Amino acid sequence: QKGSLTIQQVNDLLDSIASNNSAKRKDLIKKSLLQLITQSSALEQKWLIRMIIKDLKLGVSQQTIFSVFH
DNA sequence: AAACATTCGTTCACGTGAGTTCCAGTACAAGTCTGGTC
């Protein structure tokens, strides 16, 4: 029900997965995905899946997000 | 002295133009779904 992974750890795992895909290492990417699954909740894993697919369906335009940021 | 008109004077109903609120329709930007090839 409660996860324990921080944003920095998630970003590091995602970068490791990207390098693994570029490095032709299936075992390492599988291990990273297993760690992500075992150290996250249902909602966290759903959001991770959405981010991986690169389709969040937030409903807020990119320009609105950028304007809010600056 | 009585009747008519006239007049006339009024006032009420109806019609037209300008300001305000609301909503339908249109233009533009972005998200989202989908097509094929190497």
Curated annotation (Swiss-Prot):
Interacts with XRCC4; the LIG4-XRCC4 subcomplex has a 1:2 stoichiometry and XRCC4 is required for LIG4 stability. Component of the core long-range non-homologous end joining (NHEJ) complex (also named DNA-PK complex) composed of PRKDC, LIG4, XRCC4, XRCC6/Ku70, XRCC5/Ku86 and NHEJ1/XLF. Additional component of the NHEJ complex includes PAXX. Following autophosphorylation, PRKDC dissociates from DNA, leading to formation of the short-range NHEJ complex, composed of LIG4, XRCC4, XRCC6/Ku70, XRCC5/Ku86 and NHEJ1/XLF. Interacts with DCLRE1C; the interaction is direct. Interacts with APLF. Testis, thymus, prostate and heart. DNA ligase involved in DNA non-homologous end joining (NHEJ); required for double-strand break (DSB) repair and V(D)J recombination. Catalyzes the NHEJ ligation step of the broken DNA during DSB repair by resealing the DNA breaks after the gap filling is completed. Joins single-strand breaks in a double-stranded polydeoxynucleotide in an ATP-dependent reaction. LIG4 is mechanistically flexible: it can ligate nicks as well as compatible DNA overhangs alone, while in the presence of XRCC4, it can ligate ends with 2-nucleotides (nt) microhomology and 1-nt gaps. The lineage of its organism: Eukaryota, Metazoa, Chordata, Craniata, Vertebrata. It is linked to LIG4 syndrome: Characterized by immunodeficiency and developmental and growth delay. Patients display unusual facial features, microcephaly, growth and/or developmental delay, pancytopenia, and various skin abnormalities. Severe combined immunodeficiency autosomal recessive T-cell-negative/B-cell-negative/NK-cell-positive with sensitivity to ionizing radiation: A form of severe combined immunodeficiency, a genetically and clinically heterogeneous group of rare congenital disorders characterized by impairment of both humoral and cell-mediated immunity, leukopenia, and low or absent antibody levels. Patients present in infancy with recurrent, persistent infections by opportunistic organisms. The gene is LIG4. It is found in: Nucleus. Belongs to the ATP-dependent DNA ligase family. This is DNA ligase 4. The chain holds residues 139 to 208 of 911 of the full protein.
